[PDB]
């Protein structure tokens, strides 16, 4: 059978940095045409294994999920760099990862006068462990004064919105980005399409 492999790109909202819209299929049929259905790419290059030979690369997990990032910062999606999205929001595993695809969404997710539905988190505590959720949205205490459900000089909101005025230039755009994993390390395997 087939899988909703990249028809998920035909969706309204890719949540925020919090929820990754994790799909995590196990068995379907999918091939390179499902990747190549959509033309405009920004960061189609991938660090793990070159996409010129992605055919017959059958690995019994996808771990594939997507979100939205500002257009100023795209390069931090790479493994192991400095960046608030990649040190505080979500940091990629640095050993071996499947692929990444980036594209603009100025047409679809940039609304005039701002669209405050989107958001990104901020600094917390120690370094973010790679590939983990931080769905807690409670107010941040910097220290000492335990605070009480307010905002002040110590009570700090862990939330901040993109805004995304479409009048901004190449710096600020909705960039929809997806990441995938291709590892097997086990007994079973997924579909080997070209055969």
């Amino acid at each position: 059978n087939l899988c909703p492999f990249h028809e998920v790109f035909n969706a309204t909202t890719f949540a925020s940095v919090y929820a990754w819209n994790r799909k995590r299929i196990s068995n379907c049929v999918a091939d390179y045409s499902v990747i190549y259905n959509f033309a405009p790419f920004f960061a189609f290059k991938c660090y793990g294994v070159s996409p010129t030979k992605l055919n017959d690369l059958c690995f019994t997990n996808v771990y594939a999920d997507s979100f939205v990032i500002r257009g100023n910062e795209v390069s931090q999606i790479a493994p192991g760099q400095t960046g608030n999205i990649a040190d505080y929001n979500y940091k990629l595993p640095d050993d071996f990862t499947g692929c990444v695809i980036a594209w603009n969404s100025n047409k679809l997710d940039s609304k005039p006068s701002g669209n405050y539905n989107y958001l990104y988190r901020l600094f917390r505590k120690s370094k973010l462990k790679p590939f983990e959720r931080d769905i807690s949205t409670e107010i941040y205490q910097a220290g000492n004064k335990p605070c009480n459900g307010v905002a002040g000089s110590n009570c700090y909101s862990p939330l901040q919105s993109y805004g995304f005025r479409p009048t901004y230039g190449v710096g600020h755009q909705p960039y929809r980005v997806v990441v995938l994993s291709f590892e097997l390390l086990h007994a079973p395997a997924t579909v080997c399409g070209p055969k």
Partner: antibody
Amino acid sequence: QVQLVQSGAEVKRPGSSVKVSCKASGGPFRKYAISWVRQAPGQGLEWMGSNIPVFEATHYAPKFQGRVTITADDSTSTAYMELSSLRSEDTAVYYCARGETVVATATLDYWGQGTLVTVSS
Amino acid sequence: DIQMTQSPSSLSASVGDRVTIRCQASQDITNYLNWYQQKPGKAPKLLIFDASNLATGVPSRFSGSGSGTDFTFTISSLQAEDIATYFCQQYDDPLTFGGGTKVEIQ
């Protein structure tokens, strides 16, 4: 062990605006929280201004609300003070100050060398 | 935000004296107090943070308890270099300072 440096002394003409900087030496500049304070020659310490990576940049004294504004730059690791109008009590010397709190503006221990900012005819 | 006051603003002491300073702390806090050095003509410095435990490597003669509304701090010995101005600052109102003390060597 990290120290802190800034600009020199200015004897700029009163009835105008002034600018001064503060340059960090090490550590993650952005996620820290810089502070600022004035010492009057005849009086004590008076508070204004902070910058934070969550970007409020607005925790000011009500005595100086609408008068001072931080315009710090994270890329150059430099904090910037302006002043709306130069007045007699603006003859105080200035200080940018640093602490080991990871994000809090609460406790401060490191300081700059001071800046002599006086205005006169 | 608070009319923070210092009790008193100037002190008189001889060498090695058992001296003690009180800063008033009208707003009720829970050890939200720090003390501060200022030698005249140089940068400031801190002695005790959270009004409970010593900072860096200053000698242990500088001690204070506080813990509530009343907040006090002692030196108990004034030999060579302790003669300067002292401050205490407040957390609850974000950043405000005490009136400052002027101890003198007699």
